[model samples]
Target: IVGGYTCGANTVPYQVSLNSGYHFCGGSLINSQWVVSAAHCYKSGIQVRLGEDNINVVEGNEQFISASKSIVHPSYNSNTLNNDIMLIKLKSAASLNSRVASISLPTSCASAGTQCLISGWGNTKSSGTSYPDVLKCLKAPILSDSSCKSAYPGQITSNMFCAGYLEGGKDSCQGDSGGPVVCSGKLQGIVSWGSGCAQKNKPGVYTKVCNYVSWIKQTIASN
Candidate 1:
């Protein structure tokens, strides 16, 4: 499996390790320095894992690392979801690549109407009553910054992005919070909040990394 994945039924949106516990959303191995994921992932537990693959049935190959520390953007207000981005300091570095490869950030936000992929192991149904046992992903289209602005008013800020279905059906759920919303196979945003697990007209929102360049640079520089 190229992505450490196996074909199966529309499984529960969950990732479990034979060697370790699965509590984190997918994370990018950002090099010898950090593991990038939604800050809420860190709040879950130190004993939990950020990224891993259940490749072998007999041999689990997860290189578990402790979070030496973690930091979320200062402006990240869960209520407002202003800056939902965060990075984690791995106690150790990762060796295996690809499936557990580091996630790359978007150099710039995509133009509106571009299709971006949002992958997660969250509630299968919109209500979140059904959570998956395997990782499941759905694609969302990035609306223009202005479009999101019109919809959210002051809610959509420079450091945020808008994504969801037009009519709205499949979308991120409760368990899917704090994951990646990738564009061009690169991370353009992090899963933050949405109205009622992806309702129509209430598109999903994320922290726009394009506007946070300086902040991310500062954080990475200090680290």
Candidate 2:
């Protein structure tokens, strides 16, 4: 997240590092053994680190686990970035502690102007060149889906929504994909994509978690 500050260690316990040789995205622990992230961020050799604060080094509370399977939404589209969400089943359940817990998913969609949070170990500035090892977080206001359509045109689908500043200040940039967008202490959105790093009138796009509640539940139940 650009224009963000380093978060206190374990402040967001549900936050996890999505790693493929390196930390490339963020994920949320929605269940003891299930993690949710962006489908576009998926790749082979992907693993997850719970209770993680820094990406460069492992912490004592960290639990590194391999993914047993990755379930990307069937409707996901790479070209238009639709349904850009995925679920990862961990080989074993994550041990719950003060530094590691799961977040509750939202039952309804977030409203326009709803204040939220985006956090990750992604790039810290608009340049998109460097990333910070420590977790960073920033505040963003959820904009209406209709407003997002104006910026993305035919690309912003029903499963997608927007959040950020029109002034081009705070946002989730590269390497922040699949991270959680928490609103009212609930998991409301997942960082899917964006035009650029905090560009004018180009807010960060995300998969609307509320829109896929049934899908998410069904997938987990069947798996």
Candidate 3:
């Protein structure tokens, strides 16, 4: 995440790196065998690394898990970025502990102006060529749907919400897609897309997780 600082090691255990042979996205461990992330981040060889605070080294707490299946939302739209959520099922269950655990889903939407946290090993800047070895985190304030729509006009759909600074500062940049947007200690949103990282008047967009709670439960139960 841009305009963020390196988080303390092991502070975010439910955070997972979505590696497609290379680390390009982040995800949230929602259960021992399930991960929730942005649908657009799905790719071949995409696996997950849990309990990892750094991407460059193999931490003792870290555990790599192969993805037996990637279940993208059937209504996912790459062009509009609607229904951008996806679920990854692990071939085996995760070994849960203090440094390796799951995050809870939100019971409801985080209202506008609520402060939230987002963490990832994404690029530090929009034009940057490299990602950080350690995970970074930043605080963001949720924007009202009306205010968010003002920024994107017709592009912002009900399924999508907005966060970040409007003056071109803190935001979720490249390589952070599918990362968790935690509010009130629960998963509220998923980093989906943005207009060139931290740009003026362009807050980062996210898929509203609360809207798909039913779908998520049904998907997991059926799978």
Stretches > 4 Å off in candidate 1:
1-26, 40-44, 48-59
What lDDT score belongs to each candidate, Candidate 1 first?
A: 0.60, 0.90, 0.90
Candidates 1 and 3, the one with greater TM-score: 3
CA RMSD of each candidate after superposition = 5.1, 1.0, 1.0
lDDT of 3 at 184: 92
Clashes of 2: 0
Off by over 4 Å in 3: none
> Taking the tens digit of each residue's C-alpha lDDT, what string does model 2 give over 1-223?
8998888999999999988888888999998999999999889888899999877776688999999999999998888888899999999999999999999988878889999989998887787477888999998999987889998888888888899988897899888899999999899999988888888989899899998889999999999
Alpha-carbon TM-score of each model against the true structure = 0.80, 0.97, 0.97
lDDT leaderboard ranking? 3, 2, 1
Task: Please give the lDDT score at residue 144 for candidate 1.
Answer: 80
Candidate 1 per-residue lDDT over residues 6-101, each given as its tens digit = 223223112222112544355545455565566555463453343443322222534666667677878767667677777776667656443445
- The residue-by-residue lDDT of candidate 3 on 40-153, one tens digit each, is 997977778998987888868889999999999999999999999999999999999998889998888899999999989888876656678998999999999988999999
Number of backbone clashes in candidate 3: 0
lDDT of model 1 at position 173: 65
TM match of model 3 to true structure: 0.97
Report the poorest 10 consecutive residues by lDDT, candidate 2.
Answer: 122-131
Clashing residue pairs for model 3: none
lDDT minimum window of 10 residues, candidate 3: 122-131
